[PDB]
């Protein structure tokens, strides 16, 4: 609804979307992720991957990167996220 980011997460050969407001840090969003990804039946995970504009997949799990995620988005203000697990 509000200015939140939907974490498109593709774990294995499936897709899961976890919403995370731009006001939260790598935790909440993870806390959010774990809340949506745990359904994969493997582990709560602790790191995520995110597709960059380059056309490849990178990681994200730090305050520095976290800022890159929001900013990388800000540029397009899509309000979503192309995440991937495993």
């Amino acid at each position: 609804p509000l200015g939140s980011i939907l974490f498109r997460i593709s774990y294995n050969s499936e897709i899961f979307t976890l919403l995370v407001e731009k006001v939260w840090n790598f935790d909440d969003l993870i806390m959010a992720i774990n809340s949506k990804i745990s359904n994969t039946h493997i582990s709560p995970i602790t790191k995520i991957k995110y597709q960059d504009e380059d056309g490849d997949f990178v990681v994200l799990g730090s305050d520095e990167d976290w800022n890159v995620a929001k900013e990388m988005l800000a540029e397009n203000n899509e309000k979503f996220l192309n995440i991937r697990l495993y």
């Binding site: 960059d52 990681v59 890159v68």
Partner: protein
């Protein structure tokens, strides 16, 4: 404005990380950024291109240029 930075990625073994370097970032800066991403404090960075064997960002004139040029990077253990 508030904090202008660049969106440059990096590749470690089989993983890719993403970092933000301002228009004045030095190598050490760039390197310190990749470290917290990797699982080592002994890692190198290199501009990754069609070959994947570009130049190793060890000096500020490169890392920076990578932030400017938006050059892809590949980090590895040393």
């Amino acid at each position: 404005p508030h904090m202008k930075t660049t969106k440059i990625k990096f590749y470690y073994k089989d993983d890719i990380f993403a970092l933000m370097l301002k228009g004045d970032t030095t190598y050490k800066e760039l390197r310190s950024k990749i470290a917290p991403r990797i699982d080592t404090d002994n890692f190198k960075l290199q501009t990754k291109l069609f070959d994947g064997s570009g130049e190793e960002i060890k000096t500020d004139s490169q890392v920076s240029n990578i932030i400017q040029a938006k050059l892809k990077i590949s980090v590895h253990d040393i």
